[PDB]
């Protein structure tokens, strides 16, 4: 019933000085009864308001450089950048251009580079935190590319879910990599019931998952 | 000259009402549709609804119908977005924009933070190391944002990564800062993370040893 808007890819690596393309699809045709097709594109740089680039599939907004173009019909739509420049690193969104103005999910652009595997480290909770009643266990994934990475906590071989939170850095301006922290939070009482704490990391640069672990108290 | 200026950042508690504004200048405010867009911290854009300020014809997206009221006082070229009773999940950035025209203009955004947490400074815990090693500080359970971290009073910058804060289920924030260093420098080199949380006047220097 309701139209659904999708984009591909969800993350797009680009290289300055080369072209780039993002796709948008709608679950049903976006052609209006008046014969026009109302599909817009928007750019949002980090910490800024969105700005429209394209409306009516292919009309460029004032002030938008001609390296940006829109294409497509019915259900298939593309935004192309003929030669990417530094200022083009941003999130891009397609949007149904009539009510209810459904946005696509966004495609995040980042700087392309060779695949780089993370270096993995695990940190037990400090004795000073434990005396307060909580245990935070931290797994660090350092300097990897691309962004996609999976972290699985294991406590005495039991897979943990719902009791961790992840944070990822912005892409590093130097080596174009990412870092990520995953923090497992347990009560002191629960932490003292188990021995082996492990973090298992899966990434495109690792031929086999990497596990780092410690034994409580050791 | 054409611009949309929004009201300032909001710090509120669950249960309060809230009405934020968007003033449009440099054009005939009554003749162009105004829309509101929500962006939850880290998520994408969502359309909330539009209004024609000339006659206050309002059309809500089905996802927000009944949750908010969009209105306008055209005598002062202002549109509004209003909540009867805020929830913590209304924490987001809210944008106004001109909708449906050949020209595109957006407000600067209004950051709305809704929380029943009280101001609280962080506890700082070591992430201790045991040919490259890693160490760090865990900065836990603080409110509100932000906290700043440096290493060795700013003299150590190579290899430092300070992560974005996360919001814990408790309503308090946490973050970590790490540095990678030659394992041969452990013991001979000193590593101190300097943490500052201005809202609570908290300043901490934590020496991290193996």
């Amino acid at each position: 019933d309701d139209i659904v808007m999708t984009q591909s890819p969800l993350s797009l690596p680009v290289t300055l000085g080369q072209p780039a393309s993002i796709s948008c699809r709608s679950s049903q045709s976006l052609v209006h009864s008046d014969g026009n097709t109302y599909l817009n594109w928007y750019q949002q740089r980090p910490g800024q308001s969105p700005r429209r680039l394209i409306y009516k599939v292919s009309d460029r907004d004032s002030g938008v450089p001609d390296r940006f173009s829109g294409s497509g019909s019915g259900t298939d739509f593309t935004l192309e950048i003929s030669r990417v420049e530094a200022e083009d690193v941003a999130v891009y969104y397609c949007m149904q251009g009539t009510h209810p103005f459904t946005f696509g999910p966004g495609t995040k652009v980042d700087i392309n580079r060779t695949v780089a595997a993370p270096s993995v480290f695990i940190f037990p909770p400090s004795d000073e935190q434990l005396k307060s009643g909580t245990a935070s266990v931290v797994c660090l994934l350092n300097n990897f590319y691309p962004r996609e990475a999976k972290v699985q906590w294991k406590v005495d071989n039991a897979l943990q879910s719902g009791n961790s939170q992840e944070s990822v850095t912005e892409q590093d301006s130097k080596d174009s990599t990412y870092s990520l922290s995953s923090t497992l939070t347990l009560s002191k009482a629960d932490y003292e019931k188990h021995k082996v704490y492990a973090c298992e990391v899966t990434h495109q640069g690792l031929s086999s998952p990497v596990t780092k672990s410690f034994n409580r108290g050791e | 000259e054409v611009q949309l200026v929004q009201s300032g950042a909001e710090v509120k508690k669950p249960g309060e009402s809230l009405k934020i504004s968007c003033k449009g200048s440099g054009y005939k405010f009554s003749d162009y549709w105004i829309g509101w867009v929500r962006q939850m911290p880290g998520k994408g854009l969502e359309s909330m609804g539009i209004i024609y300020p000339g006659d206050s014809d309002t059309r809500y997206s089905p996802s927000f119908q009944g949750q908010v009221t969009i209105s306008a006082d055209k005598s002062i070229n202002t549109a509004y977005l209003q909540w009867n009773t805020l929830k913590a999940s209304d924490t987001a950035m809210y944008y106004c924009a001109i909708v449906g025209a050949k020209a595109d203009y957006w407000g600067q955004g209004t950051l709305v933070t809704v929380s029943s947490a009280s101001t609280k400074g962080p506890s700082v815990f070591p992430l201790a190391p045991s040919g490259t090693a890693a160490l760090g500080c865990l900065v836990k359970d603080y409110f509100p944002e932000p906290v700043t971290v440096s290493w060795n009073s700013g003299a150590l910058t190579s290899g430092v990564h300070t992560f974005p804060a996360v919001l814990q289920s408790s309503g308090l924030y946490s973050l970590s800062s790490v540095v990678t260093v030659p394992s041969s420098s452990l013991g001979t080199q000193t590593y101190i993370c300097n943490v500052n949380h201005k809202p609570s006047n908290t300043k901490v220097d934590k020496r991290v040893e193996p």
Binding site: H32, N36, T98 | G26, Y32, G54, I98, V99, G100, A101
Partner: peptide
């Protein structure tokens, strides 16, 4: 009536 619709379907510009 028509101006309202005109303003909604990407036909009307703004000039500072």
């Amino acid at each position: 009536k028509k101006q309202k619709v005109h303003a909604l379907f990407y036909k009307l510009d703004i000039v500072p």
